[PDB]
Tab-separated table of C-alpha atoms and ligand atoms in Angstrom:
chain	number	residue	atom	x	y	z
Z	1	UNK	CA	10.304	-14.540	18.579
Z	2	UNK	CA	12.019	-16.057	15.500
Z	3	UNK	CA	10.139	-18.161	12.896
Z	4	UNK	CA	11.962	-21.498	13.436
Z	5	UNK	CA	10.958	-22.554	9.868
Z	6	UNK	CA	12.209	-19.534	7.807
Z	7	UNK	CA	15.226	-19.628	10.251
Z	8	UNK	CA	16.292	-23.257	9.772
Z	9	UNK	CA	15.850	-23.072	5.979
Z	10	UNK	CA	18.241	-19.969	5.812
Z	11	UNK	CA	21.598	-21.081	7.241
Z	12	UNK	CA	23.639	-18.355	5.301
Z	13	UNK	CA	21.495	-15.591	6.815
Z	14	UNK	CA	22.173	-16.533	10.459
Z	15	UNK	CA	25.074	-14.127	11.088
Z	16	UNK	CA	23.666	-11.064	9.265
Z	17	UNK	CA	21.783	-8.068	10.791
Z	18	UNK	CA	4.386	20.316	19.845
Z	19	UNK	CA	4.552	21.609	16.238
Z	20	UNK	CA	2.651	21.672	12.941
Z	21	UNK	CA	1.875	25.388	12.850
Z	22	UNK	CA	-1.376	26.212	11.064
Z	23	UNK	CA	-0.746	27.574	7.530
Z	24	UNK	CA	-0.707	31.306	6.646
Z	25	UNK	CA	-3.750	32.896	4.876
Z	26	UNK	CA	-2.364	32.568	1.308
Z	27	UNK	CA	-1.375	28.914	1.714
Z	28	UNK	CA	-4.670	28.243	3.486
Z	29	UNK	CA	-6.603	29.709	0.500
Z	30	UNK	CA	-4.852	27.720	-2.291
Z	31	UNK	CA	-5.208	24.490	-0.250
Z	32	UNK	CA	-8.910	25.271	0.209
Z	33	UNK	CA	-9.428	25.684	-3.548
Z	34	UNK	CA	-7.358	22.624	-4.348
Z	35	UNK	CA	-9.171	20.393	-1.870
Z	36	UNK	CA	-12.526	21.799	-3.124
Z	37	UNK	CA	-11.607	20.872	-6.707
Z	38	UNK	CA	-10.300	17.420	-5.616
Z	39	UNK	CA	-13.388	16.419	-3.572
Z	40	UNK	CA	-15.520	17.489	-6.609
Z	41	UNK	CA	-13.321	15.479	-8.978
Z	42	UNK	CA	-13.509	12.385	-6.734
Z	43	UNK	CA	-17.311	12.758	-6.466
Z	44	UNK	CA	-17.917	13.309	-10.218
Z	45	UNK	CA	-19.191	9.758	-10.890
Z	46	UNK	CA	-19.496	7.700	-7.679
Z	47	UNK	CA	-22.178	8.146	-5.040
Z	48	UNK	CA	-21.380	7.879	-1.345
Z	49	UNK	CA	-23.112	5.049	0.490
Z	50	UNK	CA	-23.275	3.322	3.843
Z	51	UNK	CA	-21.599	-0.047	4.151
Z	52	UNK	CA	-23.676	-2.861	5.579
Z	53	UNK	CA	-23.145	-5.195	8.554
Z	54	UNK	CA	-22.972	-8.014	5.948
Z	55	UNK	CA	-20.024	-6.308	4.135
Z	56	UNK	CA	-18.235	-5.868	7.488
Z	57	UNK	CA	-18.663	-9.541	8.505
Z	58	UNK	CA	-17.337	-10.441	5.047
Z	59	UNK	CA	-14.352	-8.064	5.281
Z	60	UNK	CA	-13.514	-9.471	8.745
Z	61	UNK	CA	-13.639	-13.100	7.474
Z	62	UNK	CA	-11.351	-12.553	4.451
Z	63	UNK	CA	-7.633	-11.675	4.433
Z	64	UNK	CA	-7.557	-8.186	5.976
Z	65	UNK	CA	-4.114	-8.669	7.665
Z	66	UNK	CA	-6.468	-12.325	17.247
Z	67	UNK	CA	-7.738	-11.669	13.716
Z	68	UNK	CA	-10.077	-14.504	14.742
Z	69	UNK	CA	-11.516	-13.238	18.029
Z	70	UNK	CA	-12.979	-10.559	15.728
Z	71	UNK	CA	-14.550	-13.337	13.627
Z	72	UNK	CA	-16.071	-14.828	16.809
Z	73	UNK	CA	-17.189	-11.390	18.077
Z	74	UNK	CA	-19.093	-10.676	14.844
Z	75	UNK	CA	-21.108	-13.944	15.091
Z	76	UNK	CA	-22.010	-12.917	18.668
Z	77	UNK	CA	-25.306	-10.958	18.353
Z	78	UNK	CA	-24.786	-9.269	21.778
Z	79	UNK	CA	-22.015	-7.400	19.984
Z	80	UNK	CA	-24.538	-5.935	17.538
Z	81	UNK	CA	-26.894	-5.022	20.411
Z	82	UNK	CA	-24.111	-2.850	21.747
Z	83	UNK	CA	-23.361	-1.380	18.269
Z	84	UNK	CA	-27.128	-0.582	18.021
Z	85	UNK	CA	-26.954	1.333	21.316
Z	86	UNK	CA	-23.854	3.332	20.336
Z	87	UNK	CA	-25.127	3.968	16.791
Z	88	UNK	CA	-28.322	5.415	18.340
Z	89	UNK	CA	-26.096	7.401	20.741
Z	90	UNK	CA	-24.522	8.999	17.811
Z	91	UNK	CA	-27.375	9.748	15.447
Z	92	UNK	CA	-28.163	12.170	18.269
Z	93	UNK	CA	-24.566	13.459	18.143
Z	94	UNK	CA	-23.194	11.735	21.272
Z	95	UNK	CA	-20.499	9.036	21.788
Z	96	UNK	CA	-19.100	7.115	24.759
Z	97	UNK	CA	-17.670	3.815	23.525
Z	98	UNK	CA	-14.867	4.145	20.877
Z	99	UNK	CA	-14.652	-8.415	28.895
Z	100	UNK	CA	-16.530	-5.885	26.714
Z	101	UNK	CA	-13.497	-3.730	25.807
Z	102	UNK	CA	-13.149	-5.868	22.670
Z	103	UNK	CA	-16.768	-5.256	21.603
Z	104	UNK	CA	-16.178	-1.536	22.176
Z	105	UNK	CA	-13.029	-1.428	20.032
Z	106	UNK	CA	-14.537	-3.525	17.231
Z	107	UNK	CA	-17.901	-1.687	17.337
Z	108	UNK	CA	-16.095	1.601	16.727
Z	109	UNK	CA	-14.332	-0.081	13.804
Z	110	UNK	CA	-17.793	-1.058	12.369
Z	111	UNK	CA	-19.471	2.332	12.936
Z	112	UNK	CA	-16.557	3.907	11.091
Z	113	UNK	CA	-16.679	1.404	8.234
Z	114	UNK	CA	-20.444	1.900	7.974
Z	115	UNK	CA	-20.084	5.710	7.761
Z	116	UNK	CA	-16.828	6.127	5.866
Z	117	UNK	CA	-16.035	2.716	4.360
Z	118	UNK	CA	-17.336	3.647	0.916
Z	119	UNK	CA	-14.074	5.494	0.289
Z	120	UNK	CA	-12.150	2.247	0.287
Z	121	UNK	CA	-14.859	-0.327	-0.651
Z	122	UNK	CA	-15.921	1.636	-3.746
Z	123	UNK	CA	-12.320	2.629	-4.549
Z	124	UNK	CA	-12.537	6.425	-4.312
Z	125	UNK	CA	-8.733	6.431	-4.270
Z	126	UNK	CA	-8.312	3.745	-6.938
Z	127	UNK	CA	-6.365	5.219	-9.857
Z	128	UNK	CA	-9.393	5.464	-12.147
Z	129	UNK	CA	-11.347	7.608	-9.734
Z	130	UNK	CA	-8.511	9.654	-8.226
Z	131	UNK	CA	-6.133	9.978	-11.185
Z	132	UNK	CA	-3.020	9.930	-8.904
Z	133	UNK	CA	-3.991	7.274	-6.390
Z	134	UNK	CA	-3.208	3.593	-6.497
Z	135	UNK	CA	-5.668	2.026	-3.987
Z	136	UNK	CA	-6.275	-1.659	-4.563
Z	137	UNK	CA	-3.230	-2.190	-6.767
Z	138	UNK	CA	-0.787	-4.834	-5.606
Z	139	UNK	CA	2.934	-4.886	-6.171
Z	140	UNK	CA	2.432	-6.669	-9.588
Z	141	UNK	CA	0.649	-3.514	-10.704
Z	142	UNK	CA	2.536	-0.592	-9.180
Z	143	UNK	CA	5.719	-0.671	-11.251
Z	144	UNK	CA	3.660	-0.488	-14.416
Z	145	UNK	CA	2.111	2.705	-13.022
Z	146	UNK	CA	5.557	4.117	-12.194
Z	147	UNK	CA	6.509	3.327	-15.812
Z	148	UNK	CA	3.473	5.343	-17.105
Z	149	UNK	CA	4.135	8.305	-14.775
Z	150	UNK	CA	7.823	8.007	-15.790
Z	151	UNK	CA	6.758	8.073	-19.426
Z	152	UNK	CA	5.405	11.634	-19.157
Z	153	UNK	CA	7.841	14.278	-20.554
Z	154	UNK	CA	9.168	16.902	-18.182
Z	155	UNK	CA	11.598	16.957	-15.317
Z	156	UNK	CA	13.137	14.281	-13.223
Z	157	UNK	CA	10.978	11.963	-11.201
Z	158	UNK	CA	10.660	13.208	-7.635
Z	159	UNK	CA	9.791	11.051	-4.660
Z	160	UNK	CA	10.221	13.174	-1.505
Z	161	UNK	CA	9.060	12.050	1.914
Z	162	UNK	CA	7.549	14.333	4.549
Z	163	UNK	CA	9.353	14.114	7.889
Z	164	UNK	CA	6.849	12.354	10.183
Z	165	UNK	CA	3.778	12.889	7.967
Z	166	UNK	CA	1.152	12.141	10.634
Z	167	UNK	CA	2.484	14.882	12.935
Z	168	UNK	CA	2.487	17.423	10.065
Z	169	UNK	CA	-1.264	17.137	9.444
Z	170	UNK	CA	-2.763	20.472	10.410
Z	171	UNK	CA	-6.313	21.535	11.431
Z	172	UNK	CA	-6.570	23.041	7.925
Z	173	UNK	CA	-5.796	19.519	6.525
Z	174	UNK	CA	-8.405	18.101	8.883
Z	175	UNK	CA	-10.990	20.694	7.756
Z	176	UNK	CA	-10.384	19.850	4.100
Z	177	UNK	CA	-10.700	16.122	4.754
Z	178	UNK	CA	-13.965	16.824	6.604
Z	179	UNK	CA	-15.486	18.327	3.454
Z	180	UNK	CA	-16.514	14.711	2.677
Z	181	UNK	CA	-19.493	15.429	4.936
Z	182	UNK	CA	-20.915	17.853	2.340
Z	183	UNK	CA	-21.170	14.923	-0.025
Z	184	UNK	CA	-23.484	13.058	2.372
Z	185	UNK	CA	-27.035	13.454	3.415
Z	186	UNK	CA	-29.324	12.539	6.262
Z	187	UNK	CA	-28.504	9.606	8.469
Z	188	UNK	CA	-25.280	8.846	6.652
Z	189	UNK	CA	-24.090	12.430	7.188
Z	190	UNK	CA	-24.819	12.350	10.916
Z	191	UNK	CA	-23.162	8.934	11.322
Z	192	UNK	CA	-20.058	10.131	9.483
Z	193	UNK	CA	-19.988	13.381	11.441
Z	194	UNK	CA	-19.850	11.460	14.735
Z	195	UNK	CA	-16.877	9.575	13.363
Z	196	UNK	CA	-14.921	12.574	12.099
Z	197	UNK	CA	-15.596	14.764	15.161
Z	198	UNK	CA	-13.555	12.057	17.020
Z	199	UNK	CA	-10.194	13.121	15.500
Z	200	UNK	CA	-11.025	16.437	17.142
Z	201	UNK	CA	-10.711	14.811	20.615
Z	202	UNK	CA	-9.551	6.226	12.426
Z	203	UNK	CA	-9.213	3.395	11.561
Z	204	UNK	CA	-6.204	2.495	9.355
Z	205	UNK	CA	-8.333	2.036	6.201
Z	206	UNK	CA	-10.122	5.423	6.542
Z	207	UNK	CA	-6.690	6.912	7.551
Z	208	UNK	CA	-5.107	5.630	4.314
Z	209	UNK	CA	-7.848	7.219	2.171
Z	210	UNK	CA	-7.547	10.578	3.987
Z	211	UNK	CA	-3.711	10.524	3.924
Z	212	UNK	CA	-3.797	9.802	0.135
Z	213	UNK	CA	-6.337	12.570	-0.367
Z	214	UNK	CA	-4.301	15.147	1.490
Z	215	UNK	CA	-1.002	14.107	-0.124
Z	216	UNK	CA	-2.575	14.358	-3.595
Z	217	UNK	CA	-3.651	17.923	-2.647
Z	218	UNK	CA	-0.210	18.773	-1.272
Z	219	UNK	CA	1.442	17.573	-4.546
Z	220	UNK	CA	-0.942	19.612	-6.762
Z	221	UNK	CA	-0.121	22.779	-4.825
Z	222	UNK	CA	3.646	22.087	-5.083
Z	223	UNK	CA	3.100	21.585	-8.858
Z	224	UNK	CA	1.165	24.904	-9.125
Z	225	UNK	CA	4.097	26.658	-7.479
Z	226	UNK	CA	6.638	24.794	-9.671
Z	227	UNK	CA	4.716	26.077	-12.728
Z	228	UNK	CA	4.786	29.656	-11.416
Z	229	UNK	CA	1.031	30.050	-10.830
Z	230	UNK	CA	1.916	31.001	-7.254
Z	231	UNK	CA	5.106	31.892	-5.413
Z	232	UNK	CA	6.912	33.311	-2.323
Z	233	UNK	CA	4.793	36.529	-2.471
Z	234	UNK	CA	1.532	34.569	-2.202
Z	235	UNK	CA	2.485	32.612	0.949
Z	236	UNK	CA	1.422	35.121	3.617
Z	237	UNK	CA	-1.426	36.666	1.558
Z	238	UNK	CA	-2.343	35.661	-1.991
Z	239	UNK	CA	-1.593	38.512	-4.444
Z	240	UNK	CA	-4.671	40.178	-5.994
Z	241	UNK	CA	-6.157	38.328	-8.966
Z	242	UNK	CA	-4.349	35.031	-8.351
Z	243	UNK	CA	-7.403	33.387	-6.784
Z	244	UNK	CA	-9.103	32.918	-10.217
Z	245	UNK	CA	-5.768	31.763	-11.747
Z	246	UNK	CA	-5.530	28.970	-9.179
Z	247	UNK	CA	-9.136	27.884	-9.913
Z	248	UNK	CA	-8.478	28.006	-13.672
Z	249	UNK	CA	-5.320	25.911	-13.252
Z	250	UNK	CA	-7.120	23.363	-11.080
Z	251	UNK	CA	-9.944	23.270	-13.659
Z	252	UNK	CA	-7.978	22.937	-16.865
Z	253	UNK	CA	-4.896	21.061	-15.513
Z	254	UNK	CA	-5.804	19.119	-12.300
Z	255	UNK	CA	-6.639	15.823	-14.011
Z	256	UNK	CA	-3.596	15.618	-16.369
Z	257	UNK	CA	-1.464	16.618	-13.399
Z	258	UNK	CA	-2.952	13.861	-11.196
Z	259	UNK	CA	-1.862	11.305	-13.855
Z	260	UNK	CA	1.743	12.374	-13.217
Z	261	UNK	CA	1.513	11.121	-9.607
Z	262	UNK	CA	1.363	7.762	-7.880
Z	263	UNK	CA	0.306	8.434	-4.317
Z	264	UNK	CA	-0.139	5.893	-1.574
Z	265	UNK	CA	-0.827	7.532	1.770
Z	266	UNK	CA	2.191	9.625	2.729
Z	267	UNK	CA	4.257	7.988	-0.077
Z	268	UNK	CA	4.376	9.608	-3.489
Z	269	UNK	CA	6.072	9.805	-6.854
Z	270	UNK	CA	5.610	12.935	-9.014
Z	271	UNK	CA	6.840	13.708	-12.502
Z	272	UNK	CA	6.425	17.480	-12.900
Z	273	UNK	CA	6.359	19.512	-16.119
Z	274	UNK	CA	9.958	20.614	-15.389
Z	275	UNK	CA	12.529	20.837	-12.550
Z	276	UNK	CA	11.313	24.122	-11.040
Z	277	UNK	CA	9.449	21.604	-8.841
Z	278	UNK	CA	12.796	21.005	-7.058
Z	279	UNK	CA	12.855	24.576	-5.644
Z	280	UNK	CA	9.084	24.810	-5.322
Z	281	UNK	CA	9.285	24.714	-1.505
Z	282	UNK	CA	7.443	27.831	-0.263
Z	283	UNK	CA	3.930	26.418	-0.039
Z	284	UNK	CA	5.255	22.974	0.893
Z	285	UNK	CA	7.256	24.242	3.828
Z	286	UNK	CA	4.407	26.654	4.868
Z	287	UNK	CA	1.980	23.714	4.864
Z	288	UNK	CA	4.334	22.092	7.454
Z	289	UNK	CA	5.119	19.345	4.883
Z	290	UNK	CA	8.839	19.665	5.490
Z	291	UNK	CA	10.812	17.063	3.519
Z	292	UNK	CA	12.702	14.301	5.348
Z	293	UNK	CA	16.542	14.322	5.510
Z	294	UNK	CA	17.257	17.624	3.754
Z	295	UNK	CA	17.647	21.223	4.836
Z	296	UNK	CA	14.445	23.175	4.685
Z	297	UNK	CA	15.431	25.308	1.631
Z	298	UNK	CA	17.745	22.972	-0.214
Z	299	UNK	CA	16.376	21.961	-3.655
Z	300	UNK	CA	14.994	18.435	-4.055
Z	301	UNK	CA	16.868	15.930	-6.182
Z	302	UNK	CA	15.061	13.334	-8.310
Z	303	UNK	CA	15.689	10.403	-10.682
Z	304	UNK	CA	15.894	9.864	-14.470
Z	305	UNK	CA	15.061	6.150	-14.408
Z	306	UNK	CA	11.592	5.102	-13.129
Z	307	UNK	CA	13.284	1.758	-12.386
Z	308	UNK	CA	15.357	3.194	-9.574
Z	309	UNK	CA	12.618	5.302	-7.976
Z	310	UNK	CA	11.522	3.886	-4.621
Z	311	UNK	CA	7.803	3.598	-3.986
Z	312	UNK	CA	6.094	1.522	-1.283
Z	313	UNK	CA	9.375	0.025	-0.036
Z	314	UNK	CA	10.374	-1.280	-3.480
Z	315	UNK	CA	11.833	-0.273	-6.810
Z	316	UNK	CA	10.490	-1.776	-9.986
Z	317	UNK	CA	12.275	-3.524	-12.875
Z	318	UNK	CA	11.596	-4.639	-16.418
Z	319	UNK	CA	12.056	-8.378	-16.795
Z	320	UNK	CA	12.300	-10.231	-20.089
Z	321	UNK	CA	10.918	-13.803	-20.049
Z	322	UNK	CA	12.359	-16.652	-22.163
Z	323	UNK	CA	9.526	-16.146	-24.721
Z	324	UNK	CA	10.588	-12.486	-25.159
Z	325	UNK	CA	7.698	-10.901	-23.242
Z	326	UNK	CA	8.496	-8.203	-20.637
Z	327	UNK	CA	7.250	-8.200	-17.018
Z	328	UNK	CA	7.520	-5.238	-14.645
Z	329	UNK	CA	8.376	-6.646	-11.202
Z	330	UNK	CA	8.932	-5.356	-7.634
Z	331	UNK	CA	12.332	-5.608	-6.103
Z	332	UNK	CA	13.905	-4.622	-2.795
Z	333	UNK	CA	17.019	-5.510	-0.733
Z	334	UNK	CA	16.964	-9.204	-0.012
Z	335	UNK	CA	18.230	-9.005	3.571
Z	336	UNK	CA	15.063	-7.162	4.595
Z	337	UNK	CA	12.960	-9.691	2.682
Z	338	UNK	CA	14.437	-12.658	4.581
Z	339	UNK	CA	14.731	-10.659	7.845
Z	340	UNK	CA	10.958	-10.046	7.996
Z	341	UNK	CA	10.135	-13.750	7.239
Z	342	UNK	CA	12.425	-14.805	10.099
Z	343	UNK	CA	10.227	-12.755	12.464
Z	344	UNK	CA	7.374	-14.496	14.311
Z	345	UNK	CA	4.803	-12.414	16.243
Z	346	UNK	CA	2.532	-22.599	17.945
Z	347	UNK	CA	4.127	-24.819	15.234
Z	348	UNK	CA	1.136	-24.827	12.833
Z	349	UNK	CA	1.591	-21.067	12.208
Z	350	UNK	CA	4.732	-20.630	12.472
Z	351	UNK	CA	4.807	-23.132	9.606
Z	352	UNK	CA	1.697	-21.507	8.018
Z	353	UNK	CA	3.221	-18.023	8.326
Z	354	UNK	CA	6.514	-19.310	6.905
Z	355	UNK	CA	4.420	-20.638	3.914
Z	356	UNK	CA	2.717	-17.298	3.303
Z	357	UNK	CA	6.140	-15.676	3.095
Z	358	UNK	CA	7.364	-18.403	0.720
Z	359	UNK	CA	4.318	-18.118	-1.515
Z	360	UNK	CA	4.500	-14.316	-1.416
Z	361	UNK	CA	8.086	-14.550	-2.643
Z	362	UNK	CA	7.128	-16.940	-5.434
Z	363	UNK	CA	4.456	-14.489	-6.528
Z	364	UNK	CA	6.390	-11.206	-6.144
Z	365	UNK	CA	10.111	-11.950	-5.839
Z	366	UNK	CA	10.430	-15.113	-7.978
Z	367	UNK	CA	13.149	-13.246	-9.997
Z	368	UNK	CA	15.506	-13.407	-6.972
Z	369	UNK	CA	17.549	-16.624	-7.010
Z	370	UNK	CA	17.810	-17.170	-3.233
Z	371	UNK	CA	14.126	-16.389	-2.626
Z	372	UNK	CA	12.877	-18.788	-5.273
Z	373	UNK	CA	15.054	-21.567	-3.872
Z	374	UNK	CA	14.277	-20.672	-0.229
Z	375	UNK	CA	10.566	-20.471	-1.002
Z	376	UNK	CA	10.488	-23.972	-2.516
Z	377	UNK	CA	12.352	-25.284	0.534
Z	378	UNK	CA	9.697	-23.844	2.821
Z	379	UNK	CA	6.890	-25.162	0.619
Z	380	UNK	CA	8.700	-28.584	0.673
Z	381	UNK	CA	9.090	-28.572	4.476
Z	382	UNK	CA	5.502	-27.410	5.316
Z	383	UNK	CA	2.548	-29.848	4.856
Z	384	UNK	CA	0.827	-29.340	1.495
Z	385	UNK	CA	-2.590	-29.205	3.156
Z	386	UNK	CA	-1.789	-26.338	5.576
Z	387	UNK	CA	-3.439	-23.060	4.499
Z	388	UNK	CA	-1.005	-20.121	4.695
Z	389	UNK	CA	-2.026	-17.730	7.521
Z	390	UNK	CA	-0.562	-14.587	9.099
Z	391	UNK	CA	0.663	-11.161	8.005
Z	392	UNK	CA	3.222	-10.881	5.183
Z	393	UNK	CA	1.696	-7.809	3.587
Z	394	UNK	CA	3.620	-5.077	5.364
Z	395	UNK	CA	1.922	-1.711	5.231
Z	396	UNK	CA	0.897	-2.045	1.578
Z	397	UNK	CA	-2.877	-2.455	1.730
Z	398	UNK	CA	-3.347	-4.733	-1.343
Z	399	UNK	CA	-2.189	-8.271	-2.107
Z	400	UNK	CA	-2.739	-11.617	-0.398
Z	401	UNK	CA	-3.063	-13.832	-3.536
Z	402	UNK	CA	-0.363	-16.101	-2.018
Z	403	UNK	CA	-2.721	-16.985	0.864
Z	404	UNK	CA	-3.971	-20.142	-0.864
Z	405	UNK	CA	-3.458	-23.810	-0.913
Z	406	UNK	CA	-3.807	-23.544	-4.708
Z	407	UNK	CA	-0.779	-24.249	-6.917
Z	408	UNK	CA	1.457	-21.179	-7.021
Z	409	UNK	CA	2.193	-21.475	-10.793
Z	410	UNK	CA	-1.570	-21.300	-11.304
Z	411	UNK	CA	-1.779	-18.094	-9.266
Z	412	UNK	CA	1.429	-16.741	-10.831
Z	413	UNK	CA	-0.271	-17.267	-14.206
Z	414	UNK	CA	-3.510	-15.593	-13.140
Z	415	UNK	CA	-1.799	-12.480	-11.772
Z	416	UNK	CA	1.096	-12.010	-14.209
Z	417	UNK	CA	-0.623	-12.969	-17.467
Z	418	UNK	CA	-4.396	-13.524	-17.287
Z	419	UNK	CA	-5.172	-10.555	-14.968
Z	420	UNK	CA	-2.200	-8.367	-16.072
Z	421	UNK	CA	-3.696	-5.544	-18.150
Z	422	UNK	CA	-0.168	-4.713	-19.286
Z	423	UNK	CA	0.230	-8.289	-20.676
Z	424	UNK	CA	-0.873	-8.258	-24.311
Z	425	UNK	CA	-0.133	-11.967	-25.039
Z	426	UNK	CA	-2.342	-14.111	-22.729
Z	427	UNK	CA	-0.596	-17.448	-23.423
Z	428	UNK	CA	0.125	-19.186	-20.078
Z	429	UNK	CA	3.534	-20.247	-18.787
Z	430	UNK	CA	3.642	-24.018	-18.130
Z	431	UNK	CA	6.769	-24.369	-16.007
Z	432	UNK	CA	8.605	-22.471	-13.256
Z	433	UNK	CA	11.718	-22.790	-15.445
Z	434	UNK	CA	10.025	-20.345	-17.887
Z	435	UNK	CA	9.354	-17.771	-15.124
Z	436	UNK	CA	12.384	-15.355	-15.405
Z	437	UNK	CA	15.135	-14.408	-13.011
Z	438	UNK	CA	16.810	-11.059	-12.642
Z	439	UNK	CA	20.156	-10.690	-14.342
Z	440	UNK	CA	22.777	-12.292	-12.098
Z	441	UNK	CA	24.674	-9.081	-11.291
Z	442	UNK	CA	21.396	-7.193	-10.607
Z	443	UNK	CA	20.435	-10.078	-8.186
Z	444	UNK	CA	23.810	-9.537	-6.450
Z	445	UNK	CA	23.425	-5.710	-6.168
Z	446	UNK	CA	20.090	-6.268	-4.371
Z	447	UNK	CA	21.634	-8.592	-1.813
Z	448	UNK	CA	21.842	-12.024	-3.419
Z	449	UNK	CA	24.221	-14.444	-1.744
Z	450	UNK	CA	24.617	-16.329	-5.023
Z	451	UNK	CA	28.282	-16.911	-5.776
Z	452	UNK	CA	29.256	-17.275	-2.115
Z	453	UNK	CA	30.188	-20.545	-0.412
Z	454	UNK	CA	27.906	-20.168	2.629
Z	455	UNK	CA	24.978	-20.283	0.127
Z	456	UNK	CA	26.742	-22.789	-2.150
Z	457	UNK	CA	26.704	-25.184	0.869
Z	458	UNK	CA	23.014	-24.423	1.664
Z	459	UNK	CA	21.768	-24.834	-1.926
Z	460	UNK	CA	23.451	-28.208	-2.414
Z	461	UNK	CA	22.604	-29.535	1.089
Z	462	UNK	CA	19.068	-28.090	1.036
Z	463	UNK	CA	17.308	-31.462	1.279
Z	464	UNK	CA	19.041	-32.133	4.627
Z	465	UNK	CA	17.515	-28.870	5.931
Z	466	UNK	CA	14.040	-29.610	4.490
Z	467	UNK	CA	14.136	-33.097	6.098
Z	468	UNK	CA	15.074	-31.563	9.452
Z	469	UNK	CA	11.969	-29.328	9.341
Z	470	UNK	CA	9.806	-32.254	8.196
Z	471	UNK	CA	11.065	-34.110	11.340
Z	472	UNK	CA	10.162	-31.310	13.776
Z	473	UNK	CA	6.684	-30.562	12.477
Z	474	UNK	CA	6.152	-34.352	12.179
Z	475	UNK	CA	4.168	-37.011	10.292
Z	476	UNK	CA	2.312	-35.166	7.557
Z	477	UNK	CA	1.889	-35.069	3.748
Z	478	UNK	CA	4.794	-33.224	2.078
Z	479	UNK	CA	5.475	-32.584	-1.584
Z	480	UNK	CA	8.884	-31.872	-3.050
Z	481	UNK	CA	9.066	-28.647	-5.022
Z	482	UNK	CA	12.854	-28.528	-5.382
Z	483	UNK	CA	12.603	-30.115	-8.871
Z	484	UNK	CA	10.721	-27.053	-10.246
Z	485	UNK	CA	14.212	-25.440	-10.040
Z	486	UNK	CA	16.574	-26.500	-12.904
S	501	LIG	CA1	8.967	7.814	-0.802
S	502	LIG	ZN1	-19.156	6.277	19.373
S	503	LIG	ZN1	16.479	-4.738	-6.903
């Protein structure tokens, strides 16, 4: 279905549209070392813990992306009676779950959160703990990280994708992930072991942590090869004496090297010491981590400008505000931005989903002329008192600040200035007119319709369109935000 709100307020946009082989002995050895070093590094400060039923109820109630039959199920105590029976089933080491098909699916989601949730809840893949990870950072934060990684001297910036990542995960990758168990004791260990020994037959949040983990490991190996610690001769069997060299390199260099990566699941950006990384393909290919859209043995190509590197479906740009201060903001093609908002998965939400998109754009894509205007139109056409609901966060696991009834300039201020640790001057912005746009020709390159007549005619007749949507949804309180523009 189409969102009839995002649709009607965008007239100009109407007429647009059996593998992974197990690794060889040498590759298996270096990956073992690497993943041993990396678990130890991730465990150096934090202590694993079990997550409570109270934390789960709380994580279900908040914006976690039939989200609400889960909220009803949790308040049902007969759900927890079942969870108690299956938890007991698997402190033994047995498992048979994982109208009551909904309890069984959700229960499994709790048991897994209880046993392995600490990874995400205590931010084991947050940048501070993992060096190369970015867990918990929204799109306001990521481009600043790309600009740090990009700041490190060396080669080009590489951002290669694995071709179908999830199908390239090997039993060796699974074994290295399962070393988390060694970190745990007692009841926790047994509960986690029941979870893990289920893959062998997660849980998108556990999956994300484990994907990030493994990709971090993969990138460290590729870097090791790039730097000539290992090579083509070590693939089948590691040459004598190189074992200790690999451990020494992990030990003295692992942490600096991690700070030259931004890794989010299967997505990564690496700035190596030099461009030997481009031909460093022997361990990568032997790990089954074959790059997407390029012949197996053809050197990688990277970027010079951190501002054109794609990461998490976006590139990132420096923006200079009227007061001379510089933001770093996400940007992506605008057709895909509107296209997604036009998609509906009930008039209340759709209107409430349309409003989350709008408010998302005002937070993240305010620098795009058409999205600022289109966002204010939506916010003008949807009742002020309607809470934004629905999914707008698409496969990035952090964000959601736009899911408020609070004034969006207030939240813009809190995220871009107050809570921006790359904003030295904390003086607030008082008007939307002082919140910067892209350059005009940049806006156009990323799909702006500005300068065309189809959008000329929408921009000037916008109030007619807003009024039309006010009619359909009906007799409600509406505020006019169109005067924040100009
Ligand atoms: Ca990528
Ligand atoms: Zn079970
Ligand atoms: Zn752009």
